[PDB]
Design a protein around this nucleic acid. Structure first.
Ligand SMILES: [Mg+2]
Ligand SMILES: [Mg+2]
Ligand SMILES: [Mg+2]
Ligand SMILES: [Mg+2]
Ligand SMILES: [Mg+2]
Ligand SMILES: [Mg+2]
Ligand SMILES: [Mg+2]
Ligand SMILES: [Mg+2]
Ligand SMILES: [Mg+2]
Ligand SMILES: [Mg+2]
Ligand SMILES: [Mg+2]
Length: 182
RNA sequence: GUUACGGCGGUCCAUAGCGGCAGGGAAACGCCCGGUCCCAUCCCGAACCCGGAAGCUAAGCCUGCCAGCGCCGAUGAUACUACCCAUCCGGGUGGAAAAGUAGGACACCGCCGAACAC
């Protein structure tokens, strides 16, 4: 008896706009958002693993669901890194959690970005895939500024079912993230 | 019996694989919707699983065509070798490669089950 507003927008106007504007053979060739992954790797756990717990707490307040601790598959003596330490965090947003998190991002963080000039179009890899990395991590309203001790990382990732770059452009612009103009 | 239909299997498992080009939703096969209850995430209904058919053959799958790449492969020749003669030098009988070549080539078959007909 509940349905997110962005999902509603997608199922009412976005899909029909895409369908009419590229003239697909069928209807479900509409691209769709697939998965939302949120994570970051501190890298200094090789010296101190205490801040991993702080990163876990930060992720917990950001997504609301418990993160992960994963190791390194290779050993780098130059980085004083061997297999077995936990290196970063991991969590994934899926379904209603995708839609709520995308809402929260687009409506709270992007307007607030310090010195926001938009995002370029040229960071796709030819099939509409996009993961990337941000100036400051305390940006969401769900986290408080008084309790932070050091700048760490955090994640906002959107991906598509898109076959190539054309519908990637189309659907990302229909959804409306601050794309630059060149 | 027919079908552009799904399962279980075969063969000294690529003549059967990869890629490109077209077509399919009657039932089925898929994608799909949402997590009250079984069940689970080293997080997440992603996977498994729970409940249904609003929607769709585009992927998957199948069928058909392409020699683009892979694959199989002669007859004949060459290398090798078992045995024996010939004062070193060499020859006679038997077996016959590998590579390459003309070409072949976009699998075949068995048992049940789905729609139509008898
Ligand atoms: Mg893609
Ligand atoms: Mg039907
Ligand atoms: Mg689901
Ligand atoms: Mg198709
Ligand atoms: Mg397909
Ligand atoms: Mg070969
Ligand atoms: Mg072949
Ligand atoms: Mg011969
Ligand atoms: Mg003798
Ligand atoms: Mg002699
Ligand atoms: Mg031969």
């Amino acid at each position: 008896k509940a349905l997110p507003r962005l999902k509603q927008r997608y199922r009412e106007e976005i899909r029909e706009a895409l369908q009419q504007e590229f003239n697909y053979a069928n209807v479900m060739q509409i691209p769709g958002v697939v998965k939302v992954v949120v994570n970051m790797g501190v890298g200094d756990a090789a010296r101190d693993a205490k801040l991993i717990n702080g990163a876990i707490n930060d992720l917990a307040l950001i997504t609301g669901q418990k993160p992960e601790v994963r190791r390194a598959r290779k050993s780098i003596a130059q980085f004083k890194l061997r297999e077995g330490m936990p290196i970063g965090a991991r969590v994934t947003l899926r379904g209603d959690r995708m839609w709520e998190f995308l809402d929260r991002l687009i409506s709270i963080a992007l307007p607030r970005i310090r010195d926001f000039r938009g995002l370029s179009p040229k960071q796709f890899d030819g099939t509409g895939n996009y993961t990337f990395g941000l100036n400051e991590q305390s940006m969401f309203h769900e986290i408080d500024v008084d309790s932070i001790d050091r700048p760490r990382g955090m994640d906002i990732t959107v991906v598509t079912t898109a076959t190539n770059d054309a519908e990637g452009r189309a659907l990302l612009r229909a959804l409306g993230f601050p794309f630059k103009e060149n």
